[PDB]
Symmetry: C3
Subunit: 278 residues, 3 copies
């Protein structure tokens, strides 16, 4: 696979907050193309991102990001008046940094990780309405040399839904046996959850992959998460287990019974999935 390069680029992108059907709200990079979850933003440590933001809605909205470097003017809260008025525009700036030794000998942690952005002002001063309506999305910051995946899928447990979809409607994600598949897992709202994936497992650390034989991180296939938690991992699709419709679901029993389930559809090279009859 590929490997992430050293960062240091200054990038710019447009983002819009838009109303969607059914009282929903989403972010998008192009006007009229908002989505829930919002678009995946990927940066290498050291990169700067200027987000030229426009609120197309009739209510104030904001952009608050986890983990990355931002000044108080990009906090995205009413507290420091860094929200965006209806119809207004604003440049949010996110920075990231590499890890390194401070002059005093301590080690500064870098920005790399699985992160997310979301609204902080719709409905309440903590964005309860905006988050419920769909204003959230994933952010990945990569360290130089991190392994790059063939595909990235984002799964958000928001209240009792996955990605604000109606119960029992996935999402499903497709891969071929051997694909290096990255999962970004974000939780929002009111409830705790446990994320479980059949047939696969990952390391409970920054990258979801063990660094080598000396990494003592627990290897897991089930993880408890609460509102605004984010983690991610990579798996080799079907590794040691073969093709199939591999369930993922919240493992809180009533949540899985009510439709917080989806399928990791791992196909053979001929594109078929043994035993899978929809």
């Amino acid at each position: 696979a590929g490997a992430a390069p050293a960062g240091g680029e200054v990038r710019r992108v447009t983002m819009y907050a838009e109303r969607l059907a059914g009282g929903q709200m989403g972010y998008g990079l192009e006007k009229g193309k908002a989505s829930i979850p919002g678009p995946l933003i990927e940066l290498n440590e050291g990169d700067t991102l200027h987000v030229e933001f426009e609120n197309t809605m009739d209510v104030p909205v904001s952009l608050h990001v986890h983990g990355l470097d931002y000044e108080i003017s990009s906090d995205g809260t009413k507290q420091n008046k860094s929200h965006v008025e209806p119809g207004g525009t604003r440049t949010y700036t996110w920075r990231t940094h590499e890890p390194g030794r401070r002059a005093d000998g301590t080690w500064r942690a870098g920005s790399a990780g699985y992160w997310h952005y979301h609204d902080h002002v719709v409905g309440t001063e903590h964005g309860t309405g905006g988050i419920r309506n769909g204003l959230y999305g994933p952010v990945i910051v990569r360290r130089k040399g991190d392994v790059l995946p063939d595909a990235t899928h984002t799964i958000v447990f928001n209240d009792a839904t996955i990605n604000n979809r109606p119960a029992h409607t996935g999402p499903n994600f497709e891969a071929t046996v051997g694909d290096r598949v990255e999962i970004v897992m974000i939780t929002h709202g009111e409830y705790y959850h446990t994320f479980h994936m059949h047939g696969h497992r990952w390391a409970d650390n920054r990258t979801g992959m063990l660094t080598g034989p000396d990494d003592p991180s627990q290897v897991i296939d089930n993880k408890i998460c609460g509102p605004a938690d984010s983690f991610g991992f990579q798996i080799i699709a079907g590794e040691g287990v073969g093709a199939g419709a591999w369930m993922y679901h919240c493992h809180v029993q009533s949540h899985s019974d009510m439709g917080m389930v989806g399928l990791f559809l791992v196909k053979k090279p001929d594109g078929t999935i043994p035993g899978y009859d929809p």
Copy 2:
């Protein structure tokens, strides 16, 4: 002692059976089902063929966490890998050692504290079967892992421990200095926090720090949710001595309602100072 390299093909018979009071359990022999079900121990590289029989009048399945299995041993109705009433099926579990892939990455091995449970009784996620007692622990050891003097399994199933009536333990006994392994599994609807008085462990794969370079937090209290599993080994009474050492869920209403038990640590002469039930 230490765990050997795995690679054996092992076989075991397992039965799902009704127990008293609407409960259900797994067992290795007919009539000896238990809650939790039997402890299954493997070394990385071992294969296990579970020759499974459903003795009940409703369908049941066997779904395992962590281990390698093909979709035909998923243990779900969706993949048609459940067991009809009176039926039999061989579930196959495989395990593997860690190793460097061709692309240069490190493949994580199977070693860890895992568990198996039903996936079809009551609902297509086994909500009824899990509630009824259809769960059990699996340990997969890596070559060189330290072996314990005893292993005890503690399952927080909804507001119960091991499906026992409230305020009824279970209790476990050890002597000061014993190396005691705890397997901790959670099931059902609720989050919990597992706490043990007088003892502590490392929040990592084995529950023990690998040495002075391991940065894992050392804890005596751990949040867990449905289908979480973890485990650890402690030295009974290490630095604290003999006594009736409580363990309990630390969610206050849960400990109040009876999610509590005792780790009875005896001196070599058998005495437990001040213990008076």
Copy 3:
């Protein structure tokens, strides 16, 4: 910055349990000086601490500690008769130890970490009433060479309150940009929470700081916690982000909405906070 020395001192302190206003109860080091959270106790690995304890209330109380070494006679439970009757006195003894290789060849974990003490007998035999009333406090055990902070702040999520405070009353904590600030985070009661801090992040490990480039711990700014969980970390105030009123809060949406929120007030050297009014 400073570094913790090797421990091994026999230390002594008096502690009192007292009623406070409005049905609350607290621990203090001197009579009339009980606080919620109770006083911060700091030890170096190897130190022994003798707590000369006195119950000044009209109901039995106890003192139970997490993480530290104690004999069964200092368990602090009525079950073992290590509670304190009204007006009674008792000496609770806590010990700590350095890590080291056992005779059996395995590595014995040291006492170092972020811990806490609390009541175990008020209301119920698990201290539900006493904890609810305010009988809890932080304990920090440092390892030789641990980095010492400029200030330490304790944040306890107790049911749906912070430090038993009325909703929407903080607490707030002040620092200057560049300060090395230590946060002790304890959870009590009935609910799970997720602790989030704007503008800052830490490592999910013992110290909250990565040991160096080989530490694979996830770097986070959001962490799920349940009753009797404790963790801590150090941050450099405003590092890479600047001065400002930086929010911290539980991220469970109804909890933040109903006032489990405070401010990390990071000042410029002149003492001002950009974008914030008192």
